[PDB]
Amino acid sequence: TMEEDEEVLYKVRAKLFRFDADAKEWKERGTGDCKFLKNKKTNKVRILMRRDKTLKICANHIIAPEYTLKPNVGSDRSWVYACTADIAEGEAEAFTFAIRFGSKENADKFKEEFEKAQEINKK
């Protein structure tokens, strides 16, 4: 699965969204376990999300420290941030993401582990 040489820092169930600004519409991308994976050899923490049942990747990017977690106008359990290099479906395309969780606690906790991992990528 090419995940052995890594460590699990945070795990949460989520529904991932992407923006289609050409249509002004949110489009789902995946539902499954959103994991934070710290590289044992490079200490880099990435996001790796796989869809349930089919186990297909829908998110694969570095938790970059220059990323900012803004709220969505109609949600207290979601975060909207812009990604500049996601390699889920191939080349490092850039996406405007939104990730939603089951409750507000998991979302606020997600912002915690997301700003922690933002620091480990500065080292």
């Binding site: 600004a21 106008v73 812009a82």
Partner: protein
């Protein structure tokens, strides 16, 4: 190693939305009728290597029927679909099956009852029995909640490869990589993203 899959059924049952959920992961809320056929390559990762599906997403609207049974030629597997919220869709399953097996005499076929995510279910499970005599595999499925949405492709893959112990495995995850000439543009797309509300805020996820 790709296989041709014809997807047939009454208009409005969920054929196109089903395929988009497997391609993009999105759920299309709008009904836009298919014109003739839409061919899509769809890849699944199994413990016996990858398997590819050339999904011929056909049109159940008769006015948009296109080649009709011409699309079924050389199909190696098939999915008949109907809508459990519309009895006339299960009623037309004998027709859709009849037109199919005349071209594809001996292929694995899955019968699917979509939209089981709706309370007012009109086609009750005890009424669905057409698959028994015709040797078709049945699944209650739903493209909105993904209930059993992997099952029809897992059964066909077991039937086309010949391994009853075939299972979908996790695709290997590579490493992700790491200008101000586009920051004002990426910010321009974020200001609109925030002010566009997320769909289905009353859902579980």
């Amino acid at each position: 190693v790709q296989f041709k899959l014809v997807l047939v059924g009454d208009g409005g049952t969920g054929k196109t939305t089903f395929v988009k959920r497997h391609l993009t992961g999105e759920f299309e809320k709008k009904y836009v009728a298919t014109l003739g056929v839409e061919v899509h390559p769809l890849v699944f990762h199994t413990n016996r290597g990858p398997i590819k599906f050339n999904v011929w997403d056909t049109a159940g609207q008769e006015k948009f029927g296109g080649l009709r049974d011409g699309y079924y030629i050389q199909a190696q597997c098939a999915i008949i679909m109907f809508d459990v919220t519309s009895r006339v869709t299960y009623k037309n399953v004998p027709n859709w099956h009849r037109d199919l097996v005349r071209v594809c005499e001996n292929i694995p076929i899955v019968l699917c009852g979509n939209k089981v995510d709706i309370k007012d279910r009109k086609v009750k499970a005890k009424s669905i029995v057409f698959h028994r005599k015709k040797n078709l595999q049945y699944y209650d499925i739903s493209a909105k909640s993904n209930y059993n949405f992997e099952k029809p492709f897992l059964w066909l893959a077991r039937k086309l490869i010949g391994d009853p112990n075939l299972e979908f495995v996790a695709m290997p995850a590579l490493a992700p990589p790491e200008d101000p000439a586009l920051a004002a543009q990426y910010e321009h797309d974020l200001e609109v993203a925030q002010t566009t509300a997320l769909p289905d805020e009353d859902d579980d996820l």
